[PDB]
UniProtKB/Swiss-Prot annotation:
Residues 4-101 form the PH domain. Interacts with CAMSAP3 and CTNND1. Interacts (via WW domains) with TSPAN33 (via cytoplasmic domain) and with PDZD11; the interaction with TSPAN33 is dependent on PDZD11 being bound to PLEKHA7 and facilitates the docking of ADAM10 to zonula adherens through interaction of TSPAN33 with ADAM10. The chain holds residues 164 to 283 of 1121 of the full protein. Required for zonula adherens biogenesis and maintenance. Acts via its interaction with CAMSAP3, which anchors microtubules at their minus-ends to zonula adherens, leading to the recruitment of KIFC3 kinesin to the junctional site. Mediates docking of ADAM10 to zonula adherens through a PDZD11-dependent interaction with the ADAM10-binding protein TSPAN33. The gene is PLEKHA7. It is found in: Cell junction, Adherens junction; Cytoplasm; Cytoplasm, Cytoskeleton, Microtubule organizing center, Centrosome. This is Pleckstrin homology domain-containing family A member 7.
Length: 102
């Protein structure tokens, strides 16, 4: 992946389209970049989100998100994520913000 892994695990990512359905992907944060894969084998990169100029935080009421442990990355296009526990969400928010500072 070029760089040592800071953190990896499952997140649901919301689709940006009208229905705003969720899809579970396996994320890996390396250097300043978020990479995701179909599953935890990390075989083929499905996508990369470079994090510089994003700020990551828990969702607000006006985001209208009904999944628990949800957080968002907004530019200085917005991405909505949901973790499976409070702890994992807290760890992703800290890690994504660290990566977003170069």
């Amino acid at each position: 992946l070029g760089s040592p892994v800071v953190v990896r695990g499952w997140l649901h990512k919301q689709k940006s389209s009208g229905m705003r359905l969720w899809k579970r992907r396996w994320f890996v944060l390396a250097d300043y970049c978020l990479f995701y894969y179909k599953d935890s084998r990390e075989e083929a990169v499905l996508g990369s989100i470079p994090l510089p100029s994003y700020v990551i935080s828990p969702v607000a009421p006006e985001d209208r998100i009904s999944r628990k442990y949800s957080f968002k990355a907004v530019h200085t296009r917005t991405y909505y994520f949901s973790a499976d526990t409070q702890e994992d969400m807290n760890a992703w928010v800290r890690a994504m913000n660290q990566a977003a500072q170069v």
